[PDB]
Amino acid sequence: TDTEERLVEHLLDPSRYNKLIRPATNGSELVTVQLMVSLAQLISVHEREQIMTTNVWLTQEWEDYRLTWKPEEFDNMKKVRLPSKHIWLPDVVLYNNADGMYEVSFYSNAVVSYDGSIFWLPPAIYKSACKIEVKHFPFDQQNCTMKFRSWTYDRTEIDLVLKSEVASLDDFTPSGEWDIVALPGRRNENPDDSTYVDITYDFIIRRKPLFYTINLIIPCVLITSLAILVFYLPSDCGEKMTLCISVLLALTVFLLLISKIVPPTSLDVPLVGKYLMFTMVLVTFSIVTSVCVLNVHHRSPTTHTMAPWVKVVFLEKLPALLFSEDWKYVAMVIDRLFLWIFVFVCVFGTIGMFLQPL
Amino acid sequence: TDTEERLVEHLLDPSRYNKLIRPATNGSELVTVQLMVSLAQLISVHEREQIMTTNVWLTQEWEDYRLTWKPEEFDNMKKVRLPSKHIWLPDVVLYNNADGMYEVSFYSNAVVSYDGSIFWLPPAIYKSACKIEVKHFPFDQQNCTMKFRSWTYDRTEIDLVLKSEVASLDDFTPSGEWDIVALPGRRNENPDDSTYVDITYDFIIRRKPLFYTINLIIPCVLITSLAILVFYLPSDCGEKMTLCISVLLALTVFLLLISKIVPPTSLDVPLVGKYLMFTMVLVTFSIVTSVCVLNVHHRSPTTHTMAPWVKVVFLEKLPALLFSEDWKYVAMVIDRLFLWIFVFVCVFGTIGMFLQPL
Amino acid sequence: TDTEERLVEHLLDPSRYNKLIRPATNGSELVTVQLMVSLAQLISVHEREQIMTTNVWLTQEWEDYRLTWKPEEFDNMKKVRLPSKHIWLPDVVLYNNADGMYEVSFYSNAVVSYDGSIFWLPPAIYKSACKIEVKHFPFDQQNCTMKFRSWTYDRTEIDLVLKSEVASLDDFTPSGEWDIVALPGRRNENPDDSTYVDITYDFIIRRKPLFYTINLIIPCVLITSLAILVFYLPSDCGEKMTLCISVLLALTVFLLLISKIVPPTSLDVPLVGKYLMFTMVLVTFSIVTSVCVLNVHHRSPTTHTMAPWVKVVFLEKLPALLFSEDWKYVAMVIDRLFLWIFVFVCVFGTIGMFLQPL
Amino acid sequence: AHAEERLLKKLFSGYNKWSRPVANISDVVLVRFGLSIAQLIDVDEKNQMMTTNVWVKQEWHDYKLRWDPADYENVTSIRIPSELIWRPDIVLYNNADGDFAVTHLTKAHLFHDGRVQWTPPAIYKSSCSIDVTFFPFDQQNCTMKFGSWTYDKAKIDLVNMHSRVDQLDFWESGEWVIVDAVGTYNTRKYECCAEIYPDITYAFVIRRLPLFYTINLIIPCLLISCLTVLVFYLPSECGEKITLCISVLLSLTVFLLLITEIIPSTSLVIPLIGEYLLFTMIFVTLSIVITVFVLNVHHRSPRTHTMPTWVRRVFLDIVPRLLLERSVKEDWKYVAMVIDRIFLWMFIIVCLLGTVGLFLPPW
Amino acid sequence: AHAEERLLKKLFSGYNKWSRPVANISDVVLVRFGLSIAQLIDVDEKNQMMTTNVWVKQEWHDYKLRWDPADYENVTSIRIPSELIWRPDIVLYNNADGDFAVTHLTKAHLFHDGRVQWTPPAIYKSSCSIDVTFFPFDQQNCTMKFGSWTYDKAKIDLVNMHSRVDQLDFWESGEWVIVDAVGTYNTRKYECCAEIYPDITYAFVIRRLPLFYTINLIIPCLLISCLTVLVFYLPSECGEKITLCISVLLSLTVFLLLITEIIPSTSLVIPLIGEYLLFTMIFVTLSIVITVFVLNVHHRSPRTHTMPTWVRRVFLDIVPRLLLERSVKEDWKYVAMVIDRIFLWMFIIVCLLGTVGLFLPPW
Ligand SMILES: *[C@@H]1O[C@H](CO)[C@@H](O)[C@H](O)[C@H]1NC(C)=O
Ligand SMILES: *[C@@H]1O[C@H](CO)[C@@H](O)[C@H](O)[C@H]1NC(C)=O
Ligand SMILES: *[C@@H]1O[C@H](CO)[C@@H](O)[C@H](O)[C@H]1NC(C)=O
Ligand SMILES: *[C@@H]1O[C@H](CO)[C@@H](O)[C@H](O)[C@H]1NC(C)=O
Ligand SMILES: *[C@@H]1O[C@H](CO)[C@@H](O)[C@H](O)[C@H]1NC(C)=O
Ligand SMILES: CN1CCC[C@H]1c1cccnc1
Ligand SMILES: CN1CCC[C@H]1c1cccnc1
Ligand code: NA
């Protein structure tokens, strides 16, 4: 401690150390840095905003010839902590920032060993941007990335290495909406204007759907059924309109509710929304036929009642379907005609819908 | 000015002055600091979030033996400005912070007199937290506080004094929602783990109700009247349901609208909400009786029509109130029975409601 | 440049210059500062929040005897740029801040001439607070201010001057909601606890109403007309209730929509809101009469049908207006009576409404 | 006073801020923890995040910061800016959307024996899992992990000055009341790293005062969920049979939807009232389907099957079974009335069974 | 390495950061601009504000920062913190709600000849006027004015390294696709000030991929705005004649209102679909007024004028003209039916004329 005061003085007294300059023995020789990343918890996956908020410790490892010492020389010190701001460190940073703080959040002290090896792990919270593939809502797997790279040095003066392919889940609070499915990490190499090294971690997270399965899917599933039911209701109630309008707006409401949860992207259409929209189309065309029925129904004086049209509906269609009261009948039949159509189309439509995810 | 350059040098040349150390003549002797607070404008009273945002100049006064000089000695200087960061100042700070900046925000220079007295007034904006007593909305008086205290020194090395009980409204933009009713300030003394001094300013602000009197009260007052009217309407329209449902949801809408303006506290119930809720209860129980009426009305075949029940309603209640057509009558009467009840209960209820604030 | 390196050294080498001290020749003599303010664009006029966000260059001018030099002495230099943080500058600042950054945003270099005159203009964005007079929505002229004042020096050691009454619109992106009508600036003098100088700029901005003229006024104008129409509809539809309720809620919706756009102040009532509210009152009182009509209509057995009341309506009012079927008639007449009233009152009301802005 | 300056001169003549300050190399610093909560502000359920205002009472010692009070006119406890003195790196493991620790760095007392007392304030945004079941009568266990970062147990060990969290200067005003606030001392190996690293986990148990949400959420949706069965009793021929249904379903969905935008959208547990309002909706939608099936067969009599074994099932068998042109049309008038009362029995029976399942926990 | 430090010693022995670094006093610094967009994030239409992530490639030179590589073991390009070196004050004229420029101040390369390359990142909040007409298929010209501040053309002049903005490291993922990104070099006198001050205005042309708003906004309001004419065909005696009208008008206003809370509330141009949904509403409201005028005269026959020249106008003249108790009541039954069909013709005719006026631009 009193000797620590001496040891620190030697190593950081600027006469020996210039932080501004990277330490390697030869300028020919390159510095290699080891990078492993630890989840403490996955906080937020904002789909609308296309943003992953995680808190992360990134273990950074490298060696400095400048910071060696003999343990015998100073009370047998093996390891000493030093303020990261005063020593040199590879400016490793996210290149994936939405509204980003590019560097880490705490600037922890660095643990330095007597041989000049450095162990650093600062905590940070990170706001990574990933394209959100919204189709099979809410059972969706998001491959979300985050690029780490030295924003100062290229693949000449610094090289990057993984201590592990999978990211460390060591101290992870499991409780998210999301399940961690896989967490691999790759090292990438490509030449731009200058050669660079990319370290990319892939967070593959499966949403636990139970919430939106309840409070989104079930209600709109409930209300979509109502659509076909509208026909059965007889004109003479008057309520054929009420029930028909009520269903449409409920569906638009749920479509819009989904719209403001989903990201406003045009990459693809949310399967749920596509279904909710197509049934919505079917109910709007239901609405027009329901009106067409009612005008056929409610007036007999000075009416055409053209026999080949009354014969087709009363005499020809009625057994085809089953196997001024006549005016009421023709209404009943032109109704039940479309009902048979809608029941087939609806089930055929959901069969077509579910065929795609299967 | 050229002499100012000399004077400042003497006073701030660290050999004479150590900012890090409080100036008092004896360590026995205590420093007294005078605190008066100036409103420039009261900005926001967020009731939901229980937060007062004010911008404030707080006049801090004390004396330093270190910073004296003779005017004859230096071109008859009476007063000199000094950068607050370089001189010592009592670390006086808010202890009332929601999302708080504890100290002032922008650190003005301090005016120093030749006798060593210091005059400081920095501007800051402050986000004070106060419990919001929401009952008589919107005619409510909010006692909102803010504690000032030295976060460093206790009642040993520093003592606090008011230059005034009332806060200075000297340069105040009057235009708020709110009226400043009173603005007193108290000095408090109590021992916690260590003895301390509290300066607390009480902002008593009366809401100018005209806005919420218009766009909240008047409409729900308008719609609450609708509640009793539902009965008068005869069954044979069919519209007894429409009008009855329309009133309930309108009231729930306004109840919920109020809910998200009021703070989500359980300290007390907003009088308006309590009223809006109790009438809402009355309309929901109106809704069930309106249905009960209609089933009595619309069917005569194979009906009980038990004479002692028809006699009680047609023959006995009808004059008591005034002083299949019979089926329609019994409906009309069982209606007008509850109407008489509701008119009494509603007025009796509002009389009970208004009895409390009176 | 190499000589610039010399010149800068002389002027900023602290032995010559103490930034902490204002430069004037005599302490008797006062420093005058010239202030002109330039709009680059008017960004936001948040009426709800009573806030103007502008970006602004404020040209600050003064002279320092400390910063003179002979051009012959140093390669005929006329003008040199210096970092504002290193030289002394009058701490000129907004005293009008909502959530304010009191000083400027960039701290630009200052242009200094060989005679010791200084030219400074930093960019900033400013969040000025102004009371918003909301009456003639949306054709409203908002006089919005911003106070500039030295937060350190009073009218003793510093004096403030305008280079122009009107603010400079030199590089202004015109495209706002708002039109710049006038932009004067005044110099104010009054004694508080100490004498001070106020520079206040008045932004007078006229809202281009076309947007709210379309998407606010036109729809509520459309729906307000519906109010009187409710009567014409005959009881026997049953739909006299539906249409009557539909109009009220639509109006309350629009009132509430306006309420959350307008600032929640009680200084005055938005003319639109006042109109929308008063018609709303008229429709709520329409709603009760529509019910009163229907009970008169739908029952003849064991009814009073008191002749002097049937005579007044069928026999006396009907020609006065024009110049169980009788029961239906009395309904039709007591209806058309109020219809004549409402058409007059509505037009008389809008004539009274529009009389005030005219 | 002059002495006070001169004391600072001697302290910071040759004092290293970056030194782990103990006499012996092995010997440890004892750092003491007193957690003083200033106010509980936001308990944002949807984000699973708690915003607290906290003082972190930290006490430790320096052999290098000792002096003789008699040597300096009986000055014994001098206050010195923390930034200059060595300071333990106490941090929040559990932080979200905030700086980890000690942003303000306020001044600390130094006693003449060299012990140092530091009580700086700070705003912490703890991230606790929110169990929503018995809304709004819910108790939440929210924790705050305070530990060192770079120093292991070998070099820094933490001590509880109290097991309970200090609530003496607490801001009572909230929709919550503190049930109990608990400090637990733990030690662990973290897998990244070799050594043992201690922590203090501070568990706030908080209960929501429900009386607010009781009024504005629970009472109206009970008032509303009443009307589900009431639809059946309304006569078909009024024409309002469905107008009541649609209003119930939609009004319910509004309350479910409003509730869901307030719940944390987790799949751990189903929010109890949400599950209730869900099953209500399922019954209502079912009630709409049947009430339309009531109206369809009800009106028309010409060219109708009217099979006797079914009309005898309804008028002759079931009518007493549940109790214990006109000829055909009114046959239908009753048949619908019976299909009606049968389901009114169904719903009013099952409704109470559902709510008995809702009150099984308080039972 | 030792050489690398010693190089820094010699560079910053007597180096002035505040000196405008050129050999001659008159001679200028050439500053080169390469704009590398990292990602386009928010294009908030309502605020007229664009949030971009940008690298600002700045190249210039110092005669004072030269050295001999052979003198120092062939070190030729050393990276030095920008804060110490003189640096041009490149700023955004067009900033809203943000710092003007170069907040991060990352490190810059120095070549042995004294040229310096600086590519720092930063987040800019550009403020572009948003022209909403052909929503959502709209092309927006959003600009970012990069210029010096204190230095005129005499002392600083800017050069385009590309006319096009560098998109090589761009984050493709958005609801937008870049149509073309253009760099324009301009010079101007600004009225405050004496001299000529150059700038580079970078115009991003962006097109919204409409497929999102096409689904959730345009399709439903077309589905809804269909039903405006449909009201007329419904028979009066059903009693639902207005219930359809009110639903259409209100549902339309919801979509107009929803659209308006997304548009920038400007009065430059009328948002085309907004103008459409407005005129639809005007027709619907008109449709409600007439639809009530239909029902009033329709029902009652006692004590009615029933002037022949009008009933002959309707039953005898117009009925074929458009085609190419009971006695009076049914006279009205037809008369309303004709006033009906007449307006159904009116609306279905004008509707298509309105939509032809909507598609006049693609025409
Ligand atoms: C995840 O994302 C990137 C880009 O989509 C892809 O290249 C990579 O292979 C994916 N990783 C895995 C394990 O799915
Ligand atoms: C106002 O507030 C404080 C704390 O709420 C209370 O102690 C004080 O008595 C109150 N004073 C007035 C005048 O209401
Ligand atoms: C503008 O505003 C202030 C206060 O509203 C007022 O004193 C001033 O006279 C006004 N100026 C003009 C030109 O209207
Ligand atoms: C609180 O929570 C923690 C972890 O969530 C748990 O370990 C602890 O036992 C709980 N304590 C109490 C008093 O509920
Ligand atoms: C874009 O706008 C700028 C000015 O805002 C204009 O000068 C430039 O020509 C425009 N470019 C295109 C491609 O529209
Ligand atoms: C205690 N920290 C939490 C996990 C890693 C560990 C640690 C150890 C050494 C230096 N910094 C951090
Ligand atoms: C180019 N800047 C923008 C407008 C003013 C001009 C300028 C001139 C001199 C010093 N600073 C700024
Ligand atoms: Na409705």
Curated annotation (Swiss-Prot), chains A, B, C:
Residues annotated as site: Key residue that may interfere with effective access of the conotoxin BuIA to the channel binding site: T59
GO biological process entries: acetylcholine receptor signaling pathway; associative learning; B cell activation; behavioral response to nicotine; calcium ion transport; central nervous system projection neuron axonogenesis; chemical synaptic transmission; cognition
Transmembrane segments: 214-235, 241-257, 272-296, 335-354
Entry membrane topology: Multi-pass membrane protein
Carbohydrate attachment residues: N26, N143
Positions of the record's site feature: Key residue for a rapid dissociation (K(off)) from the conotoxin BuIA: V111, F119
Pfam families per the UniProt record, alphabetical: Neur_chan_LBD, Neur_chan_memb
Cystine crosslinks: C130-C144
GO CC terms in record: acetylcholine-gated channel complex; cation channel complex; external side of plasma membrane; membrane; neuron projection; neurotransmitter receptor complex; plasma membrane; plasma membrane raft
Catalytic activity: Ca(2+)(in) = Ca(2+)(out); K(+)(in) = K(+)(out); Na(+)(in) = Na(+)(out)
Keyword Transport included in the entry's annotation: yes
Purpose: Component of neuronal acetylcholine receptors (nAChRs) that function as pentameric, ligand-gated cation channels with high calcium permeability among other activities. nAChRs are excitatory neurotrasnmitter receptors formed by a collection of nAChR subunits known to mediate synaptic transmission in the nervous system and the neuromuscular junction. Each nAchR subunit confers differential attributes to channel properties, including activation, deactivation and desensitization kinetics, pH sensitivity, cation permeability, and binding to allosteric modulators.
Disease note: Epilepsy, nocturnal frontal lobe, 3: An autosomal dominant focal epilepsy characterized by nocturnal seizures with hyperkinetic automatisms and poorly organized stereotyped movements.
Protein family: Belongs to the ligand-gated ion channel (TC 1.A.9) family. Acetylcholine receptor (TC 1.A.9.1) subfamily. Beta-2/CHRNB2 sub-subfamily.
Record's protein name: Neuronal acetylcholine receptor subunit beta-2
Organism: Homo sapiens (Human)
Swiss-Prot record, chains D, E:
Regulation: Activated by a myriad of ligands such as acetylcholine, cytisine, nicotine, choline and epibatidine. Channel potentiation by calcium is stoichiometry-selective, CHRNA4:CHRNB2 nACh receptor is achieved by calcium association with topographically distinct sites framed by anionic residues within the CHRNA4 subunit and between the CHRNA4 and CHRNB2 subunits. nAChR activity is inhibited by the antagonist alpha-conotoxins BuIA, PnIA, GID and MII, small disulfide-constrained peptides from cone snails.
Sites where a glycan is attached: N24, N74, N141
Main location per the UniProt record: membrane
Lipid-modified sites (S-palmitoyl cysteine): C238
Extracellular topological domain residue ranges: 1-216
GO cellular component, one term: neuron projection
Keyword Glycoprotein: yes
SUPFAM superfamilies cross-referenced by the UniProt entry: Neurotransmitter-gated ion-channel transmembrane pore, Nicotinic receptor ligand binding domain-like
PROSITE patterns with a match to the protein in the record: NEUROTR_ION_CHANNEL (PS00236)
Keyword Transmembrane: yes
InterPro entries per UniProt: Neur_chan_lig-bd (IPR006202), Neur_chan_lig-bd_sf (IPR036734), Neur_channel (IPR006201), Neuro-gated_channel_TM_sf (IPR036719), Neuro_actylchol_rec (IPR038050), Neurotrans-gated_channel_TM (IPR006029), Neurotransmitter_ion_chnl_CS (IPR018000), Nicotinic_acetylcholine_rcpt (IPR002394)
Effect of E45A: Loss of CHRNA4:CHRNB2 channel opening potentiation by divalent cations
Membrane-related topology note: Multi-pass membrane protein
Annotated disulfide bonds: C128-C142, C192-C193
Single Gene Ontology BP annotation: action potential
Family designation: Belongs to the ligand-gated ion channel (TC 1.A.9) family. Acetylcholine receptor (TC 1.A.9.1) subfamily. Alpha-4/CHRNA4 sub-subfamily.
Self-association and partners: Neuronal AChR is composed of two different types of subunits: alpha and beta. CHRNA4 forms heteropentameric neuronal acetylcholine receptors with CHRNB2 and CHRNB4, as well as CHRNA5 and CHRNB3 as accesory subunits. Found in two major stoichiometric forms, LS (low agonist sensitivity): (CHRNA4)3:(CHRNB2)2 and HS (high agonist sensitivity): (CHRNA4)2:(CHRNB2)3, the two stoichiometric forms differ in their unitary conductance, calcium permeability, ACh sensitivity and potentiation by divalent cation. Cells produce predominantly an (CHRNA4)3:(CHRNB2)2 nAChR.
Disease per UniProt entry: Epilepsy, nocturnal frontal lobe, 1: An autosomal dominant focal epilepsy characterized by nocturnal seizures with hyperkinetic automatisms and poorly organized stereotyped movements.
Name of the protein: Neuronal acetylcholine receptor subunit alpha-4
UniProt source species: Homo sapiens
Annotated gene: CHRNA4
